[PDB]
């Protein structure tokens, strides 16, 4: 399958401009339609526009016209989207997608880029262990508190531990900072024979924290 | 503006048939597309040109478009099919996605496993105390978490978060955090999380004594 790789998550000030890249790896963007679609958190998909690199013609949603620009570089097989005059309502996951010419469907999508539009300062999380003070099963976890913006990625034992893992959606605190928890259920007997380390990465503040959850 | 209306939620018992509708004005005259989006993942094309299926899509997925309605049909629905589904058609030279439907795949009632976590020493040194209650692997989604500090019902000092249905077992998990200042935290002994759910004959209380 053609893989569409998009640039990293970003925080942008209102009134500014954002540029998202979409690299086609193992395929081409020539003789195809490259389209940008966005999704605000907990909301639906919204079509922004399309571009045909070969015919050098774009078509933008009437509501994005004059504020969005879709471009492509032939030698690199990379598409770009530029959204100017950013507003709080522009906070969304931006997806790039490829589809056939004269066919308005999209068979290949990128992973998406979260673009947060805020005046607020970037802040790395404080990571605290959640350990019990339960029968055959115990729960351990990590409390990822007071961070901004989203996202935060959490893994257990550098990604080796995946089964029994629940990473909860972040909650917005009254302070305007995000808080999240990540839990793992394990056998009670394992709390004395095994190590459980939660790895937290917050790319916007370039923070990386490894925390052991012990009872 | 063109609006493509979809029901916000659709439920299916395993093995049964899910029908997700998309309602639009001249819909039958347009080619409809359908996308599947699992929690935290990119959309996947499931149907194009009203009823065509991409190579990687099981034959249990089918489409139809007539008059003012397109329908996505999922025969023998499985836990694997839990996702948000979006219809898509063109109008006035613009790609229009439908309202979106969350498809819930039913399972048997599962009571939650309840766990309470006291605040870490590291957090108490910061000035705040977060007490965490976990409700793990329950079904259905409806559950009530009641915080009690020294038998006193708490209000306005907690926030909760629920996961989407699990891809294999079709359950939910819930996390609730009670935030207090270190000073208010040290004025009390008993910290309790009281849980109500369909699968519980009586409320389940998980507690600890500070210290």
């Amino acid at each position: 399958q053609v893989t569409l790789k998009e640039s990293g998550a970003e925080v942008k000030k209102p009134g500014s401009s954002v540029k998202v890249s979409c690299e086609a790896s193992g395929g081409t963007l020539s003789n195809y339609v490259i389209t940008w679609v966005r999704q605000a958190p907990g909301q639906g998909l919204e079509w922004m526009g399309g571009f045909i690199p070969t015919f050098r013609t774009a078509m933008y949603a009437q509501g994005f016209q004059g504020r969005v620009t879709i471009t492509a570089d032939e030698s690199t097989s990379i598409a770009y989207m530029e959204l100017t005059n950013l507003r709080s309502e522009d906070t969304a996951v931006y997806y790039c997608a490829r589809g056939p010419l004269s066919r308005g469907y999209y068979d290949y999508w990128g992973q998406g880029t979260l673009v947060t539009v805020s005046s607020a300062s970037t802040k790395g999380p404080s990571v605290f262990p959640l350990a019990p003070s339960s029968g055959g099963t115990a729960a351990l976890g990590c409390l990822v508190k007071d961070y901004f913006p989203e996202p935060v990625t959490v893994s257990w034992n550098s990604g080796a531990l995946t089964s029994g893992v629940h990473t909860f959606p972040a909650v917005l605190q009254s302070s305007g900072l995000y808080s999240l928890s990540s839990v793992v259920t394990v056998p009670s007997s394992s709390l004395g024979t095994q190590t459980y380390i939660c790895n937290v990465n917050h790319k916007p503040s370039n923070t990386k924290v490894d925390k052991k959850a012990e009872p | 503006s063109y609006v493509l209306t979809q029901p916000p939620s659709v439920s299916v018992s395993p093995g049964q048939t899910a029908r997700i509708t998309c309602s639009g004005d001249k819909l039958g005259d347009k080619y409809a597309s359908w996308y599947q989006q699992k929690p935290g993942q990119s959309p996947v094309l499931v149907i194009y040109q009203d009823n065509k299926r991409p190579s990687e899509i099981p034959a249990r997925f089918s489409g139809s478009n007539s008059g003012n309605t397109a329908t996505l049909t999922i025969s023998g629905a499985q836990a694997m099919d839990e996702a948000d589904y979006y219809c898509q058609a063109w109008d006035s030279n613009t790609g229009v996605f439908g309202t979106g439907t969350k498809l819930t795949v039913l399972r048997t009632v599962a009571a939650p496993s309840v766990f309470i976590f006291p605040p870490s020493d590291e957090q108490l040194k910061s000035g705040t105390a977060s007490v965490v209650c976990l409700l793990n692997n329950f079904y259905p989604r409806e559950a009530k978490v009641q915080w009690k500090v020294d038998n006193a019902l708490q209000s306005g000092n907690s926030q909760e978060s629920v996961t989407e249905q699990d891809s294999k077992d079709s359950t939910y998990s819930l996390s609730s955090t009670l935030t207090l200042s270190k000073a208010d935290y040290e004025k009390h002994k008993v910290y309790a999380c009281e849980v109500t759910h369909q699968g519980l004959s009586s409320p389940v209380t998980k507690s600890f004594n500070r210290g």
Binding site: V33, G50, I52, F55, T57, M59, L101, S102, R103, G104 | D29, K30, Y31, Q49, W90, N93, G95
Partner: peptide, 11 residues
């Protein structure tokens, strides 16, 4: 115009 046709299929 006629370019819109490269973006989707008319039924």
């Amino acid at each position: 115009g006629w370019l819109a046709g490269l973006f989707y299929q008319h039924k």
